[PDB]
Design a binder for these strands. Structure first.
Ligand SMILES: Cc1cn([C@H]2CC[C@@H](COP(=O)(O)OP(=O)(O)OP(=O)(O)O)O2)c(=O)[nH]c1=O
Ligand SMILES: [Mg+2]
Ligand code: NA
Ligand code: NA
Length: 332
DNA sequence: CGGCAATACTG
DNA sequence: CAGTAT
DNA sequence: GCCG
């Protein structure tokens, strides 16, 4: 009795197989660095299964029946169960390649491809990357420029303060608008790499053109250090940026502002609350098991044999016939 | 053996 | 398009 | 890497 999709089972903040799941997630990460999203995904699913188990895996046989556990995931677990360590995992963690790809990929703007190219070229440090400025995307120039701040875990108190500045901004334009903290904090975490906010208003349309003015406002306060505006397919609805959060005298924080109509707020909240892996299993389950496709705006039937609406996340869970799981249980 | 979540922007 | 972000 |  272990549902296959992570959106069918609870995934709490703290569980009973930390050592084991971290081992699998390291392989998932390593595969990622080797550009194998297939293997990364499979390891990630096994790790997710472990986070869900009601108690620690004492015997290698408690694995029997558990989905997503092939020969490879199985050998790794077994090895940690007897000797309390896995060689494949330790060699990965100690290897020069894994350690560098990790360091490079935590720089905002740097992904696996860029990281690999730089690695193959013999580059090994952030300072080596800074010496070649006329090569870096603006996203990366920013990541390197505020590297220290962006690496410092964000605290709930930083999230609070930002919510104060955002709500004040929104208040200068749209009275009665609501700003909701999403992302990991909504899931109960104490830290994050950034802060996510979802804005909306009860009256449809009363929120159009909101973001630009909110940004213009933050801009006048001279807090915007970087930004990128998005528009769903001025007049943009999403803002991915870095703000100078005063308190050093200030600290740079990544912030993502999302403006959504209240008709589709339940889908916006659902997508932006995560976890990341939770979204994937959710959307995958929507398709592979329900012929429908889910996104940040709504649920859709390729064939207009049915249309969808929702008032809360609970509604969206009904439409997919999934037992509800509050934010805190989506840490997949 | 094919699929693996679904979108938006920069360069 | 290639690559990175959520 | 695991699955249908
Ligand atoms: C990266 C990513 C994220 N999401 C959703 C689901 C989560 C929210 C917030 O993202 P974040 O990585 O900060 O996640 P968060 O959980 O807040 O992590 P931190 O605590 O900040 O590290 O966005 C997604 O659908 N697809 C993706 O590829
Ligand atoms: Mg976050
Ligand atoms: Na990065
Ligand atoms: Na984010």
């Amino acid at each position: 009795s272990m549902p296959a999709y992570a959106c069918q089972r609870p995934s709490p903040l703290t569980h009973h197989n930390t050592l084991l799941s971290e081992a699998l997630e390291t392989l998932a990460e390593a595969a990622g660095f080797e550009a194998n999203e297939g293997r990364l995904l499979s390891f990630s699913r096994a790790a997710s299964v472990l986070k869900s188990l009601p108690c620690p895996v004492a015997s290698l046989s408690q694995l029997h029946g558990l989905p997503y556990f092939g020969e490879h995931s199985t050998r790794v677990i077994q090895e940690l169960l007897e000797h309390g360590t896995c060689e494949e995992v330790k060699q990965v963690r100690c290897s020069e390649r894994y350690q560098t790809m990790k360091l490079f990929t935590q720089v905002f703007g740097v992904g696996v491809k860029t990281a690999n190219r730089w690695y193959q070229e013999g580059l090994r440090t952030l300072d080596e990357l800074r010496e070649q400025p006329q090569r870096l995307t603006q996203q990366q120039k920013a990541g390197l420029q505020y590297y220290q701040d962006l690496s410092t875990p964000v605290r709930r108190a930083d999230a609070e303060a930002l919510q104060q500045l955002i709500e004040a901004a929104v208040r200068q334009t749209l009275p009665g608008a609501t700003v909701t903290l999403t992302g990991g904090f909504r899931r109960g975490k104490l830290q994050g790499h950034d802060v996510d906010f979802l804005i909306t208003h009860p009256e449809e349309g009363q929120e159009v053109g909101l973001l630009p003015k909110v940004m213009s406002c933050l801009q006048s306060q001279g807090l915007v250090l970087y930004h990128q505006y998005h528009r769903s397919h001025d007049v943009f609805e999403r803002s991915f940026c870095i703000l100078g959060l005063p308190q050093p005298t200030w600290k740079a924080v990544r912030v993502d502002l999302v403006v959504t109509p209240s008709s589709q707020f339940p889908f916006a909240l659902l997508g932006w609350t995560g976890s990341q892996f939770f979204e994937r299993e959710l959307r995958r389950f929507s398709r592979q098991e329900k012929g429908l496709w889910l996104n940040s705006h709504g649920l859709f039937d390729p064939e207009q044999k049915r249309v969808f609406h929702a008032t809360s996340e609970e509604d969206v869970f009904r439409l997919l016939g999934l037992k509800y799981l509050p934010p805190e249980q989506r840490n997949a």
